[PDB]
Amino acid sequence: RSFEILLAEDNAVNQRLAVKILEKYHHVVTVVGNGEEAVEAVKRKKFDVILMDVQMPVMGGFEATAKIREYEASLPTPQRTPIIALTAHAMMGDREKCLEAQMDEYLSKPLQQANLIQTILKCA
Ligand SMILES: [Mg+2]
C-alpha cells in the first residue's frame, strides 16, 4: 500500500500538485528541486519509486538517473529503484528514449491522477 516516493521537480507549483495527489493516496513524499538533490537523497534513503522531472536546473533527470543507477549498482547488496520520467512534452518515441536513459516509465505533465497512481503501482 503506502510508498516512500522521491519527487524531483523544479517548479514549486508542480511540486505542490504532485504532493497533493500522492498524499491523498497515503504516500510519503520527499520533495527535491533538482537532480543533484535527488542523487543525494538516494544515497541517504531507500525509496519505493522516484518521480523525476526531465528538465531541471543544476542537473536534469537523465543525468540524475545515470548517477542513481551507477550508485545503486555500486552497493554491496545492489538495488534498483524504479524511476518514472515526468515530461511536459510527449508522444514521439519519448518513452523509448526514457527507457534507453535507464528510466522505467514516463508521465506527461500536467500530471493525471489515475495515470500517476496506476504507474506507481505498476512500478513499486
Ligand atoms: Mg522542470
C-alpha dihedral sign at 59, 61, 66, 68: positive
**Determined by which method?**
X-ray
From residue 19, give the alpha-carbon distance in Å to each of 7, 30, 76, 84, 113. Answer: 8, 9, 32, 15, 11
Is 58:31 a contact under the CB 8 Å cutoff? no
Is residue 53 part of an annotated ligand binding site? yes
How far apart are the CA of 76 and the centre of ligand 1, in A? Answer: 33
How far apart are the CA of 14 and the centre of ligand 1, in A? Answer: 9
How far apart are the CA of 68 and the centre of ligand 1, in A? Answer: 18
Only one residue has cell 528514449, namely 97
For 4-123, give the CATH class: alpha beta
Is 3:49 a contact under the CB 8 Å cutoff? yes
Of 10, 91, 94, nearest to 53 by C-alpha is 10
Is residue 55 part of an annotated ligand binding site? yes
Q: What residues pack around ion ligand 1 (CB closer than 5 A)?
A: 10, 53, 55-56
Count of CB atoms situated within 10 Å of the CB of 30: 16
What Å resolution does this PDB entry report? 1.9
What single DSSP character describes residue 31? Answer: E
| CA dist., res. 117 & res. 17, Å (int) | 13
| CA dist., res. 35 & res. 103, Å (int) | 14
* Amino acid (one-letter) located at 104: D
Provide the strand spans (E) within the chain.
Answer: 4-8, 28-32, 49-53, 83-87, 105-108
Domain positions in the chain are 4-123
Of 103, 112, 89, nearest to 35 by C-alpha is 103
